[PDB]
Each structure stands twice: as structure tokens, then as C-alpha cells.
């Protein structure tokens, strides 16, 4: 069975992993190799079978789990494209809802104006038609008395004359559409901004936090620093002891939020958000790395952003001292933007931080020192 | 016929404008009055009739014309409300057209991404299904050779072993949707602005006007000041002789217009509009009351508005020196606004005049002095 020495295969060559005849093995191709008897070779190779079997089983289970992961990835591609479509739909429907509402309201007002013009004009019209037929009647009553016997002419001519005269002097006495010009596009665009914001987050001045000088009122939505001297504050690690400030009890942790506060003519204040990880006791250092994101006003008109530096950044003083501040907070984009919100229609950006906030934050209102009575105005949540 | 003296009426009392008897007139109620005979009274009163008749005719014609004016005013109320509605429709359709187009384009891109994911994933999936069935075939081919007569086991076991081994090591190798976050509203809003503008007015550098140093190129839409020394200009009262400037041949007279000019890195220039009523010869004083509405750049980075004062107003230097200026002109609102237009998506306002321009204006481009070679860059109409 050697096929070359005609003598069957009985020796296994281990360096060539093939069978051989006794001669190839004695003095032939395989004379110097490592060889052993065939029975021992098969009994040595058979022992490797459990491990080859299990390496195959394990490889197949790996690939099966990968197949499972890919099959899941397909439906997650489906769902992701679905949510993308739906999110575009919803963010654009905000704008389309606004335009639709605006157009309908403009149209209602148009119809109102035009109908009122119609009735006013038609009234003056029918009252001239009456006056004009009175004139007609005068004219040919005058021609009735124009040619009649002498004495009856004398008996009524000058009553007719007087009547004519001052029904001539009884003569009758004599729109408001907001017609639109080129900057209307631009006014609608500027008004759309305020609507792009989320519904006003309805927060609450949290008396569990307020500095002992402050009082909350109007259902926890107005904070006022008091005429009177206050007791010292206890060591509750999140009541304010030195900085006269107060937080909302609502903790903001995800998504996007918008809120407005009415400052009016208050000469000094600060507004923004404080991290939950930083404590509120002792003197505070108003820079981001302390968990403080603050916009401030001092001396009635000087507006300072409290960004990570030594000095705060002076800002462009607006036309008027801002009477209401709007605050937009996006965690997804790490953004705290401050807006002049005195115009209830159009928002004007003051400043914005671009920092991914570490974790959850509280809206903080520094209703700053009463300073011997000159800063007694309140903070009002709009 | 007196009804009190029984004796007929024959005398007319002129101060009481009534008839009387001879007795009332002789010694009675009317004894001291002014009286005349009845025949003369009727012959005196009859003469006033033509003028009373014509005063009536003229009063009636006046009221008739007023009736005509009111009747016209009604249909003009109709047409005014119609045009108001249609103008709101059209200015808002601008915005709605934009949003619709944007949503469709986002959707097309979504489908593209998802289909390509589908094919890539399904390819890797069917190629693992093939690899896994190969593993199956390996496994029970291995079990076919696991238990067979000695020598044929030895004759093929280790070819099977090698095959298994490196088809095990032949193992297989291992989306891009622009998924949208909260500031997408805001990006779409900022991109809408550029679309609120009217179609680019397609102007032409008018060589009939250019200062003798300049050359127009690219179909009258690029002006460059030349290396070379120029001839003096003739006394055509609207060619520029001292200020090296050039106008569009298009005269703007009504409505609203928008155009963009590419300045790039040009260190010094001015752009804006010049009145047709002011002449372009000699040295020019760049303030409004001379018919010049100009924004300027000097020393590469300093941006000055040329408003009616002694000094020009310095402006906020943008992040980068602006590479393209956009100009919006509304006569209806008396407005010339300048925009940073380097971002082909979002426009940023530099400055705007708020003055009702007297009459028609030309777009003027001060392609300022070549200044011995350092300001040789061109002005390009976008
Ligand atoms: Zn042999
Ligand atoms: Zn050998
Ligand atoms: Zn009498
Ligand atoms: Zn009398």
C-alpha cells in the first residue's frame, strides 16, 4: 500500500505528518526524521479532537452572537432614522405653527377693519341719499310756488325761502388697516425667536435655601430683601449664609429649559445657575470652575459676565437698563444664554456660556445686598 | 281776507315778510314798518328765484360727486384688504417655502443614509451566515474523520486539522446620520434670514463711470485698480476724477434690493450707494448730506460707518476681517443695511443707515487707492 515500495503503511512520520512504509523509514525519503508506530500516532492525534471540536463550537457561538448584534443594529437604524424625521418634523412644526397662527390673526383683523369701514361708509352713503332726495323735494316745491296767483305766492314764498336756505346749510358733516411694508418679513422673523423657546419653566423661590434676610411671596415666585435685621442662619449646608441668594427648588438635570425674571430698575443683582456639587456657605467665588454661571448688574447700568478669569467681562450696555432677563439652558449643547427680554416680542442676546455643565444645576438668583436701603426692589419670576 | 279786519291783503310788510290789510298797515300792528304794494313785492321776490334754483342745483351736484367718491372708497377698501392679505401670504410663503424645502432635503439625506446602512449591514450579515455554515461543515467533517479505520484516519486527519485551523483564522474582518439636537431650531432660524432677502440684484460695473485707473472684467462684474499709470479723465460730469470709484449702471429707484460684493483680504475699500443728484468730480465728503452712504474698511481690519458727523463711527471688529459684504436697500423704509456675508449661510449685521433717501441712488464701490501696490486686490460682484 506504499504505492512506491508496494509494502503497506505502518510507520507515521511526525515531521511530515504522513504515513510511510518501513523502507522510506529505514533508508529512504524519511530516514532521519522523527517517526513512531501508526497505532501510537492515531492514539495521540485522537486526543486533540476534543479541543478542536470545542474551538469550533466556540467560534460558531461567537459568530452567532455577532450575527445577533448586527440584526439588532438594523432595527436600530430604522428607529434612529424614524426619530430623526420626527424631531425635524417637530422642531419645524414650531415655526410653522407660529406662521399659521400669525397669518390667521392678521386675517381676522383685516376682516374686522374692512367690515367696519363698510358699515361706516354705507351709513354716510344712505344719509347723503336721503339728503339728496330732500334737495330734490325742495327744488320742485320751490317750482310749485314759483308760478301761482299773486297773494298766495306772497303768503308762502318766504317760508319756502327760509326752509330752503337752512336745509341747504343743514349739509352733512364731512381706513385703519396695518398695511405691511418690506421689513415685515424681518419683524416676523425677529418675533419667531421668542416662540422657538420652550414653555416657561415654572420655578419656585425655595425658602429652604434663602438667605435669612430675604422673604418669598406670591406663591414662592417673588423674593424681596427686607428692611429689617435678620437672624443668623443655621448650618444647613444648602442655605445661603454670606451671599444673599436663593435658588429654585426645581433641580434641572437634562434637556433644555427657559425662564424669565423681572428685575426692572433694580440697581444690583446677579442671575444664573449654580451646580449642585458646590456648597453655598461662606464667601463664594463667582467663576465657572466653582459651579457658578452668573450674569450680573451693578450701579444700575453696568452688565458683567462672570466668566473664568480674574476680572468679569464688561458687556455692551443696552439702550435701556434691561427690565427682564431670559435664560436658556441646554445640557445637550452645554449652553447658558442670557437675553434682554424687556420687549415682550423680541429677545436680544446679552451673553452666553459655552461649557458642558458637569451635572445637575439649580437656577440661582443673587438678590444682592440691600446696601442700606437703596436696593430694596424685588426679583420676580415671569 | 285779512281774517281780523275782514278786508283783503293788499300791502306786503317787508320787515315781517308777510301780507297785511290796509288797516294793519295804516294804524295797526304794522304801522311803522317798511311796506310796499303787493304787486311790487311778488315782482321783487320772483327775481330771487333763479339764484335759489341754481344754489339748489349746485348743492345737489356737490353731494352727488361726494356720493361718487364714497362709492369709489368702498371698492378701494375691498382692494386694499385684498392686497394686504396677498402680501402677508407672499411674505410668509417665503418662510414656508424655505422650511418645506429644508425638511424635504433632510428627509432625502435620511433615506440615503439608512439605505446605505441597510446594504452594508446586510452584506456583512450574509457573509457571516456563509462563514457560519462553513464552520458547521468543518465540524461534522471533523466528526466524519474522528472515527474511521486507523490508517485512513492517519492519511487525512492532519490535512483536516490544518484546514480547520486556518479557516478558523480566516474569520470575518470586524451610522452617519446628522442626528439633530436642541440648537437646530436656532440654526434653521439663522439660515432663514439669508432667504428672507430678495433675489440677488445682478449689477454691472459701469465703465462709463470708472476712475481712469480701474479696469472692468468678467462681464462688467469685477473691478481692479491697475499697476499702470492712467490717463487723466475727461469732463464727463459722472466719471470719477479724484475718488477712485465706480458705480453700477443700474439705477435703483423703488422697492427693495440686495447685493453682495466679494472683498476678501482687500485692506482698504468703501461700499454703499451714492445719490444721483450729487456729482462725482473733485474731492468728495463722505457723509449722507452729500448723497453718500458708505461703509468703509482701512488698514485691513478697521471698519467705519460714514454717518453724518465729523469723524466716522468705529464699529465692532468681527472675528475675521469680513470677506464678503451684503447690502440691503429699502426705499419704502429708508434703510441701507450692511451685513457680514462671509458665511454663505448666516448673515451678521455690521451697520445700517435709517434715513429716507431723497430720490434714486446708484450702488457705488470705492475700490480705494492702489497706494503704491499694496491694495491691488479686486472688487467682485457676487
Ligand atoms: Zn516506502
Ligand atoms: Zn518524513
Ligand atoms: Zn288788518
Ligand atoms: Zn309788519
Residue numbers in the entry:
A (entry chain A), B (entry chain A): 85 to 258, 263 to 470
Original paper wording:
After introducing point mutations and deletions, we were finally able to resolve molecular models of mouse TRIM72, including RING-deleted (ΔRING, 2.75 Å; the highest resolution is in parentheses), full-length (FL, 4.6 Å) and wild-type (WT, 7.1 Å) TRIM72. The overall structure of the TRIM72 dimer has an elongated shape. The coiled-coil domains (CCDs) form the main scaffold of an antiparallel dimer with a length of approximately 17 nm. In the middle of the CCDs, the structural core consists of the hendecad repeated region of the H1:H1′ helices (prime indicates the second protomer of the dimer) and the H3:H3′ helices followed by a pair of PRYSPRY domains. One side of the H3:H3′ helices is wrapped in a four-helical bundle with the hendecad H1:H1′ helices, and the other side contacts the β-sheet of PRYSPRY through hydrophobic interfaces, hydrogen bonding and ionic interactions. PRYSPRY comprises two antiparallel β-sheets: one sheet (β3, β5–β8 and β12) forms a concave surface, and the other sheet (β1, β2, β4, β9–β11 and β13) forms a convex surface. First, several arginines (R356, R368, R369, R371 and R386) and lysines (K317, K330, K389, K398, K460 and K462) are situated on the concave surface, consisting of variable loops (VLs), and contribute to its positive charge. Second, each PRYSPRY domain displays a concave surface that is positively charged toward the same side, facing opposite the CCDs. Recent cryo-electron microscopy (EM) analysis of TRIM72 and the crystal structure of TRIM72 ΔRING also revealed that the CCD ends are dynamic.
Tripartite motif-containing protein (TRIM)72 (mitsugumin 53; MG53) has been determined to rapidly nucleate vesicles at the site of membrane damage, but the underlying molecular mechanisms remain poorly understood. Here we present the structure of Mus musculus TRIM72, a complete model of a TRIM E3 ubiquitin ligase. TRIM72 is a member of the class IV TRIM proteins, which is the largest subtype among the 11 groups of TRIM proteins. Its domain organization includes an RBCC domain followed by a PRY motif associated with a SPRY domain identified in splA kinase and ryanodine receptors (PRYSPRY) domain.
